[PDB]
Amino acid sequence: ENLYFQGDLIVSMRILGKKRTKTWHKGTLIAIQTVGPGKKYKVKFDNKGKSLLSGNHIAYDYHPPADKLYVGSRVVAKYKDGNQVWLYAGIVAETPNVKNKLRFLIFFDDGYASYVTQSELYPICRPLKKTWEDIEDISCRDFIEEYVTAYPNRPMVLLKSGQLIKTEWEGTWWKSRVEEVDGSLVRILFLDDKRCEWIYRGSTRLEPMFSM
C-alpha cells in the first residue's frame, strides 16, 4: 500500500537519507510504501535524484533531546575527513558526563571514533532492534555488539603521554607513541610514518588490550 502517515513520519517532510557513497544528505520524503510487514521510504535529494530506502537509512533533520539517546543509539554525526566534513552513521558509546566534559562519544561504522556535541548529531528514524546489525564491516560490528552489551563494564588501558606502545594498522603491529589523552580516547603517533590518529582506549588495535 501507499501511505501518507507512518508513526511520526509524514509525506512531504524534510529528512536526511543515506546515499550510495555512504554519506548522508538532505532531501524530501515523497512516498511511503508497504509490502506485508516491510516498509520503504522514497526520498528525493536536494541536489540529485531519488532512492527507495529502508527505515534505518533515513534520519530526522533535527538534533535529539538528551533523554532520548542511550549507549547503543543509532545516529548520524559530523565526521572529519581531512579538511572536509561529512555526515556519517555511528553508534553512541558515551552520553555527556563530567569525565568527558559533557560530550557524546561516537563509534562510526568504519571504525573511527570521536567526541561530538548535541548539535552535531541526528537520530536515525527506524533503527534495528539490535542497532549494530546493519553495520557492514564484521570486525567493527562485532566490537560494538560486545561493547554495547557489556556496558558499563568497560576494560580500558591506562595511558600517559610519552608512553611507547604497539598499534595495529592494516593487519600488523607498528611502533607508536601516546601523544595526548582526551577522556576515553588517545591520540597515537605512528613513529615510522609520523602521522596521528585518535583511538578508543579499549580498542583491540592497542597491543595491551589485544593482550588481555
Curated annotation (Swiss-Prot):
Protein's cellular compartments: Nucleus; Cytoplasm; Chromosome
Transmembrane segments: none
UniProt PTM comment: Degraded by the proteasome, shielded by interaction with ATF7IP.
Superkingdom classification of source: Eukaryota
Expression tissues: Widely expressed. High expression in testis.
Residue ranges of every copy of the Tudor domain listed in the record: 68-131, 158-212
Family according to the record: Belongs to the class V-like SAM-binding methyltransferase superfamily. Histone-lysine methyltransferase family. Suvar3-9 subfamily.
Domain notes: The pre-SET, SET and post-SET domains are all required for methyltransferase activity. The 347-amino-acid insertion in the SET domain has no effect on the catalytic activity. Isoform 2 lacks all domains required for histone methyltransferase activity.
Miscellaneous remark of the record: Highly up-regulated in Huntington disease patients, suggesting that participates in the altered chromatin modulation and transcription dysfunction observed in Huntington disease. Its down-regulation has salubrious effects on patients, suggesting that it may be a promising treatment in Huntington disease patients.
Protein's job: Histone methyltransferase that specifically trimethylates 'Lys-9' of histone H3. H3 'Lys-9' trimethylation represents a specific tag for epigenetic transcriptional repression by recruiting HP1 (CBX1, CBX3 and/or CBX5) proteins to methylated histones. Mainly functions in euchromatin regions, thereby playing a central role in the silencing of euchromatic genes. H3 'Lys-9' trimethylation is coordinated with DNA methylation. Required for HUSH-mediated heterochromatin formation and gene silencing.
Subunit structure: Part of a complex containing at least CDYL, REST, WIZ, SETDB1, EHMT1 and EHMT2. Forms a complex with ATRX, TRIM28 and ZNF274. Probably part of a corepressor complex containing ZNF304, TRIM28, SETDB1 and DNMT1. Interacts with TRIM28/TIF1B. Interacts with ATF7IP and ATF7IP2; the interaction with ATF7IP protects SETDB1 from proteasomal degradation and is required to stimulate histone methyltransferase activity and facilitate the conversion of dimethylated to trimethylated H3 'Lys-9'. Interacts with CBX1 and CBX5. Interacts with DNMT3A and DNMT3B. Interacts with SUMO2. Interacts with MPHOSPH8.
Protein name (Swiss-Prot/TrEMBL): Histone-lysine N-methyltransferase SETDB1
Region of the whole protein represented: 196 to 401 of 1291
